[PDB]
Design an enzyme around this catalytic site. Structure first.
Site, PDB file in Angstrom:
ATOM      1  N   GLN A  49      30.299  -0.466  27.124  1.00  0.00           N
ATOM      2  CA  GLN A  49      31.428  -0.356  28.074  1.00  0.00           C
ATOM      3  C   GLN A  49      31.705  -1.706  28.843  1.00  0.00           C
ATOM      4  OE1 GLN A  49      30.123   3.493  29.653  1.00  0.00           O
ATOM      5  NE2 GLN A  49      32.144   3.981  30.414  1.00  0.00           N
ATOM      6  N   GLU A  50      32.922  -1.834  29.430  1.00  0.00           N
ATOM      7  CA  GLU A  50      33.391  -2.973  30.244  1.00  0.00           C
ATOM      8  C   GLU A  50      33.167  -4.390  29.690  1.00  0.00           C
ATOM      9  OE1 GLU A  50      35.792  -2.929  32.434  1.00  0.00           O
ATOM     10  OE2 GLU A  50      35.528  -1.307  33.911  1.00  0.00           O
ATOM     11  N   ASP A  51      33.298  -4.566  28.361  1.00  0.00           N
ATOM     12  CA  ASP A  51      33.123  -5.843  27.646  1.00  0.00           C
ATOM     13  C   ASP A  51      31.681  -6.105  27.200  1.00  0.00           C
ATOM     14  OD1 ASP A  51      35.840  -7.887  27.483  1.00  0.00           O
ATOM     15  OD2 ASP A  51      35.928  -6.244  28.975  1.00  0.00           O
ATOM     16  N   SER A  52      30.953  -5.010  26.939  1.00  0.00           N
ATOM     17  CA  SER A  52      29.620  -5.002  26.370  1.00  0.00           C
ATOM     18  C   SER A  52      29.843  -4.603  24.902  1.00  0.00           C
ATOM     19  CB  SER A  52      28.733  -3.987  27.084  1.00  0.00           C
ATOM     20  OG  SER A  52      27.787  -4.599  27.945  1.00  0.00           O
ATOM     21  N   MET A  53      28.850  -4.845  24.055  1.00  0.00           N
ATOM     22  CA  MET A  53      28.939  -4.537  22.632  1.00  0.00           C
ATOM     23  C   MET A  53      27.590  -4.177  22.085  1.00  0.00           C
ATOM     24  SD  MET A  53      29.593  -8.373  21.094  1.00  0.00           S
ATOM     25  CE  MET A  53      31.271  -8.651  21.810  1.00  0.00           C
TER      26      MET A  53
END
Ligand code: ZN
Ligand code: ZN
Ligand code: ZN
Lengths: 46, 114, 266, 65, 134
Positions: free
Chosen positions: E2-6
């Site tokens: 989430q929120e620009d995590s991968m």
């Protein structure tokens, strides 16, 4: 077999004293590299 | 650098047992088996098998955090049925199910030519 | 034979296609996980580099060596060094390979998985011979050397599961599909104008009876009958991937059964 | 920088198919896709592995010491 | 993720996905002034010298250089240079506090001015860890 340095230009085994300056004896070129320890490094193939 | 050793995934630590069976504080005849150094390969399998036992009221599992190889299995059985047994029976049933499968695949493999 | 039923459609040296009838999703899936991870195999887990005058880094070479697939046949008669009594490794827990290559030829010299050499006494076990499926007989290309270069090293291959490092995978890809007609309505197909014309229908559609359009939805139906294809890397033969798959899964259930009996005393 | 052994995604051994791949293109005068397939490289993760590989080793070897 | 995590396939990573080599080349030179007054490259002992690093110098050879191939970590003195005082006060280079690797190569050359000067490179494999940016 038991060296100190190696010339980078002509890949040549050498070894000299700090009392005898730098550069390659039978090449010229002022470079020089330390040469691998005989110590032996172990790697996890991970 | 702050990462754990990849064997921490299947190797039990200092002391540390596989199963920790703790009585459920809430509803009666229920228990919480904490399986140490385990994932969905075992969780889901035991859980789904437990759900076939027509005397097990409740049976669910959760993996509270992905960093850790450890799962929580909750079991609730009918009066006069120890959940420890319900699990034992489930485990046993799986081994047998797998037994047949080995025997069957083995049989079929021999009939196959390549 | 009583429960779960196997029907092998295709089989090769390193690939098996079959059907898994009369089984629960959990079992089918758990088998696929244990086949990916939990099966032990032999892999280089220690490179000792004497000489390396190649263009490649020591660790870069060590890394590849680990990935090199090698015979894991008699792997159940090799111990996990962790539980072996020796200080470090031995013959009962490890396989010792050697690699010495020197670019002597004016042309580029290629180093292959074929060039590794067992030095450990195997005690007649089918183990650690670099698996070579390549037509020309050479293995995996490990390195390349110019006329000058030399690479002198020693390898310790050890017992381990994929779940610790991907190198230990007897693995490769496992195909897995159930209900190629979405009769279960176990997925809601995204479409623009038509789900049927837009989604390409499965190879496994031949093996099942197509829905019934103006017929009620089978609410009581439970997912059973799994279409699978297991690919071997080469360390263990295909039959053994699934046989050992079944086996090790069966094993960990048994340890959990045996676990209960120990808490039963005190 | 030499053909990786095994495909990152799936694990199918790819470190042996390289030279073989180059013959198919050079000598056998085949196209990339058919050549890839001819090597048993079915999945796209295995396809990319060889297709997008740049073998700089050849260039490094070229350096004199 | 989430929120620009991968999320990365740890499996892919072990197979060599996104792996890289890291090289840091440390350097130094014997003196900058004095017609007889020179600094020195050597492994220093107790020699009334006192003011020194540690991190152990113990990985240095007689020339005051690590040999290529040694694993270096912490604050391991990688170059052993000394300043003479009218007593050998330190002037030795520790490996970058945060870092750890294996000595890749050591170059011993001279300057336009004719002075001993060294360049020490260190290799480290950086494997796709947690908060690594992609
Ligand atoms: Zn020279
Ligand atoms: Zn041993
Ligand atoms: Zn692949």
């Amino acid at each position: 077999a038991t060296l100190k340095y190696i010339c980078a230009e002509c890949s040549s085994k050498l070894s000299l004293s700090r009392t005898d300056a730098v550069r390659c004896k039978d090449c010229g070129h002022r470079i020089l590299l330390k040469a691998r320890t005989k110590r032996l490094v172990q790697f996890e193939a991970r | 650098m702050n990462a754990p050793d990849r064997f921490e995934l299947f190797l039990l630590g200092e002391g540390e047992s596989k199963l920790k069976i703790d009585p459920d504080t809430k509803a009666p005849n229920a228990v919480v088996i904490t399986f140490e150094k385990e994932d969905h390969t075992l969780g889901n399998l035991i859980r789904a098998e437990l759900l076939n036992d027509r005397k097990v009221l409740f049976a669910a599992y959760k993996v509270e955090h992905p960093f850790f190889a450890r799962f929580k299995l909750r079991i609730q059985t009918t009066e006069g049925y120890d959940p420890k047994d319900a699990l034992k029976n489930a485990c046993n049933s799986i081994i047998n199910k797998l037994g047949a499968l080995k025997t069957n695949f083995e049989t079929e493999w021999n009939l196959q030519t390549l | 034979e009583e429960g779960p039923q196997v029907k092998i459609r295709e089989a090769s040296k390193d690939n098996v296609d079959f059907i898994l009838s009369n089984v629960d999703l959990a079992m089918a899936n758990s088998l696929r996980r244990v086949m990916i991870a939990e099966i032990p195999t032999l892999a280089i887990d220690s490179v000792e580099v004497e000489t390396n005058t190649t263009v490649l880094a020591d660790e870069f070479i060590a890394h590849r060596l680990g990935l090199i697939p090698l015979q894991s046949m008699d792997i159940e008669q090799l111990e996990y060094s962790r539980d072996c009594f020796c200080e470090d490794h031995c013959d009962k827990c490890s396989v010792v390979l050697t690699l010495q290559a020197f670019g002597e030829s004016e042309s580029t010299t290629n180093v292959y998985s074929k060039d590794l050499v067992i030095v450990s006494n195997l005690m007649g076990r089918n183990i650690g011979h670099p698996i070579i499926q390549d037509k020309e007989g050479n293995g995996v290309l490990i390195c390349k050397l110019r006329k000058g270069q030399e690479l002198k090293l020693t390898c310790v291959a050890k017992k381990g599961i994929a779940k610790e490092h991907a190198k230990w995978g007897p693995a490769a890809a496992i195909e897995f599909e159930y209900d190629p007609w979405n009769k279960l309505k176990h997925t809601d197909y995204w479409y623009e104008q038509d789900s049927a014309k837009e989604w390409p229908q499965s190879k496994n559609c031949e093996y099942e009876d197509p829905p019934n359009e103006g017929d009620p939805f089978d609410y009581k139906a439970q997912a059973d009958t799994f279409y699978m294809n297991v690919e071997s890397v080469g360390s263990i033969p295909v039959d053994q991937v699934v046989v050992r798959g079944i086996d090790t899964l069966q094993k960990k259930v048994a340890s959990i059964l045996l676990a209960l009996t120990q808490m039963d005393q005190d | 920088m030499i053909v990786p052994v095994r495909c990152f995604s799936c694990g199918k051994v790819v470190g042996d198919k390289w030279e073989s791949y180059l013959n198919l293109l050079q000598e056998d005068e085949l196209d990339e896709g058919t050549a890839l397939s001819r090597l048993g490289l079915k999945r796209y993760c295995c396809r990319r592995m060889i297709l997008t590989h740049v073998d700089l080793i050849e260039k490094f070897l070229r350096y004199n010491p | 993720n989430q929120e620009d995590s991968m999320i990365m396939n740890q499996s892919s990573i072990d197979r060599g996905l996104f792996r890289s080599l890291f090289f840091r080349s440390y350097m130094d030179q014997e003196k900058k002034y004095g017609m007889s007054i020179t600094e020195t490259f050597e492994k220093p002992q107790r020699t009334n010298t006192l003011r020194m690093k540690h991190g152990t110098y113990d990985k240095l050879d007689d020339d005051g250089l690590i040999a290529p191939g040694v694993r270096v970590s912490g604050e391991d003195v990688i170059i052993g240079k000394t300043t003479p005082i009218s007593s050998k006060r330190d002037a030795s280079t520790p490996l970058r506090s945060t870092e750890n690797g294996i000595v890749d190569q050591v170059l011993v050359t001279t300057n336009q001015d004719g002075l001993k000067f060294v360049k020490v490179r260190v290799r480290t494999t950086k494997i796709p860890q947690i908060g690594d940016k992609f």
